[PDB]
């Protein structure tokens, strides 16, 4: 159940004339392609982005996408003309297409459409259909779009056959990048809490890859259950950043440590004690005026 391949399309329609479509492609949490509106061709963001496909096979798909992008734009504009009072610019459409890969040549495909930020339409089997909660007026556009047997046939091709095949090539060719292990670097800080005489201890953890990580404030072998893990934040070099906070009363700091478990570390956890020789020296280099 290892990997999700995602083609993400972002289409903005301001008015009857102005429009742009930009796309990005992801395998897991690594970016493989980008497609700007002003770019005629799909760009590779990795050396292995073409997968196992030949130059002829790639050019064939690229040509198909070029026709589609232009065709999508006008089709939406026509639907607005058709839908009239119901809908009207500005229009924001997000499209998420791809497949989830599994061990043993097993695959599931998907094509999801969001309208004005809300998930409204999916391609299922042989045709478009509304999802629960979708506005009732979508019934007509879906009927109209489902009358296009040609578009449907190519969608089915890309979903049933082209995704699973292409992704498998991507998984093989990008093996070294997908299986990379980058070591986390941890450092400590603190700020005053809203409560008087209380402090919030912050354990910063940066530069780790892959994403799964374990961070807890500790007093000896005792996990501090007041530890609040933050959100995973991306770094520019395709690594992750995370911080865990803990609320203590002034004086409680001594004896506490931030512990970090990560696959790149082996079995050798990073243990960072609050009062440490290194923390003291690193804090000296961190001083500022606020």
């Amino acid at each position, epitope marked *: 159940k290892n990997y999700t391949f995602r083609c993400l399309q972002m289409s903005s329609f301001a008015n009857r004339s102005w429009s742009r479509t930009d796309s990005v492609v992801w395998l897991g949490d690594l970016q493989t392609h980008r497609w700007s509106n002003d770019s005629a061709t799909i760009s590779f963001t990795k050396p292995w982005s073409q997968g196992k496909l030949s130059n002829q096979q790639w050019e064939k798909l690229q040509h198909m996408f070029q*026709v589609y992008r232009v065709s999508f734009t*006008r*089709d939406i504009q026509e639907l607005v*003309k*058709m839908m*009239s009072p119901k809908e009207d610019y500005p229009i924001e459409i997000q499209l998420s297409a791809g497949c989830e890969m599994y061990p043993g040549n097993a695959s599931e495909s998907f094509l999801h459409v969001a309208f004005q930020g809300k998930y409204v339409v999916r391609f299922w089997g042989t045709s478009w259909q509304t999802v629960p909660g979708a506005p009732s007026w979508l019934d007509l556009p879906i009927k*109209v779009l489902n*009358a*296009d047997q*040609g578009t449907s046939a190519t969608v089915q091709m890309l979903l049933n056959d082209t995704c699973p095949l292409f992704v498998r090539g991507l998984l093989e060719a990008g093996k070294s990048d997908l299986e990379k292990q980058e070591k986390p670097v941890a450092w400590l800080s603190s700020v005053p809490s809203s409560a008087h005489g209380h402090r919030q201890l912050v354990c910063h953890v940066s530069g780790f890859y892959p994403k799964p990580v374990w961070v807890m404030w500790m007093r000896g072998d005792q996990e501090q259950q007041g530890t609040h893990r933050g959100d995973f934040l991306p770094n520019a070099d395709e690594t992750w950043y995370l911080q865990a906070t803990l609320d203590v009363e002034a004086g409680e700091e001594a004896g506490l440590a931030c512990r970090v478990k990560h696959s790149s570390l082996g079995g050798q956890d990073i243990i960072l004690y609050w009062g440490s020789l290194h923390h003291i020296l690193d804090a000296q280099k961190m001083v500022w005026n606020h």
Partner: T-cell receptor
Amino acid sequence: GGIITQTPKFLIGQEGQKLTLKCQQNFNHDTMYWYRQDSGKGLRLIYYSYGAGSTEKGDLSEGYDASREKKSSFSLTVTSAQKNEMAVFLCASGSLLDVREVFFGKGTRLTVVE
Amino acid sequence: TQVEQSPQSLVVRQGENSVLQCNYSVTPDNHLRWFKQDTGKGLVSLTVLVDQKDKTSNGRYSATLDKDAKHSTLHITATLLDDTATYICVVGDRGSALGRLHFGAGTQLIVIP
């Protein structure tokens, strides 16, 4: 199982006069079209409609206006008839759920007199 | 402009076979169809072609479509005097009613007895 009829079949125009062409259809078609046929060129879309009162500009909308009063009826107006203008106008209707189903009217021949 | 028909004018002896050509560059090319227009009249549907390599027939009319070559030929078998008309090739750019039709200038067929 029906007809699409344009009226009038022939139209006498005068320089600067406003002209009105009517097209009626009982195919139960939501989409209706107004084309212009010039010699040696090929049909060119003036206006089209998804229903009343949808009026959408085609590539040759300038100098014309259109109105869809109801589903069966789609009118085209010539805003200002040109001096020596001889023209042929063709109405068509199509099914919204079948792009291959399109029927055309018999045409309207316009001659603008001095 | 995007739909080109040749020849401009075809003269065929009665009883003989006529061949009419259409070349296009419209994309996508979902379907191509042929229309007959009598003088002082409208367009009458002859045949609709849909597949990558397609053959259709309708009475004495038959047509072929090659999408890779972007080329279509209309055939008229055993030409009668009533075949005298303009023949128009038309390409539709979508498989849905959101599409537009692209009209050829037409081929005048003249059938001499």
